[PDB]
Amino acid sequence: SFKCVNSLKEDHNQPLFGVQFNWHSKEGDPLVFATVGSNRVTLYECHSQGEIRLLQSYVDADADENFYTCAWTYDSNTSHPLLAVAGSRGIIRIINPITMQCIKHYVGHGNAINELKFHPRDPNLLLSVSKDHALRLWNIQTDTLVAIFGGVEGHRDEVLSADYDLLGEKIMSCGMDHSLKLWRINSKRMMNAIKESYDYNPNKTNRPFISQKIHFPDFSTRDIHRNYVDCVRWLGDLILSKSCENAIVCWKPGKMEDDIDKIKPSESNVTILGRFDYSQCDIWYMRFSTDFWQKMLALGNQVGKLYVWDLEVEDPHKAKCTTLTHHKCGAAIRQTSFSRDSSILIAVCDDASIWRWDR
């Protein structure tokens, strides 16, 4: 049961578009989260009595940059956490969270990057989704572009969100074209591509690294929402997605009995397993999050109200909703983040405020 223990506001007064706890923080280290907004990323540490201790920021050299998204990983050789950030410039920056140095950056996307996600099993595999209608899969060990998910049969407008399934065998993406698309990355072609990305060392060869051009999703639907689809999450073999229509829909491709790995690209059907309604979230780019174990789901709305669903029930439609309000929290909440142990929930807002809720 959450209580609001603290809040603060960042000095830039611009929206905080993203927040992420570091789920790779070491045993006995305090809980750390990153916020992104304006042209900066800031790290904070959670301490007792609701204390949110300010650490250090990375500020982009370009005053016109606007960071939208961040995602945590770790260096696969040293174990040290890394933070990937991206936004309107379409440049991915890999940040050393200790010093806030930009270690390296990746350019490619035709435009703004709307989301970053790391593979659940491989800390080096970074997925970016873009205003340019495409997804890109990067290997941040060998600094290679593994594949581009695009084409006529891919998204036809900005991609706003994507999520890897549990094992990182497939991705579901969504965007402004109202569609949700499945891209399997466990095909013979994609698995070989990933392996080749690891064998690539530009200093030991003459060849450039060749990226896969993936031009056909393994499933596609526009039958779930009737506006911009701005957030998607796997829930096992089921999907959770939302638009700006005041609902999270729980659904699956095919008919009720259809196995996700038996779904063919021509699949015409979807099955709706439930829908979580809420209020006043008519603006787009408003993201829900889940805890580490996927026992709960949190979403903020456009007037600063938090919705939390308990998913620890037998069927999706039986989820139990709880609400969290504070009389001074009135700005739009863009994203939430649970600490890994689920003891803390952070919400960040359009007025640069940060809200801490302790369980």
Binding site: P15, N227, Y228, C244, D282, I283, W284, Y285, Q302, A332, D350
Partner: peptide, 7 residues
Amino acid sequence: RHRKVLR
């Protein structure tokens, strides 16, 4: 139709 930020 669909705003990113509140008017």
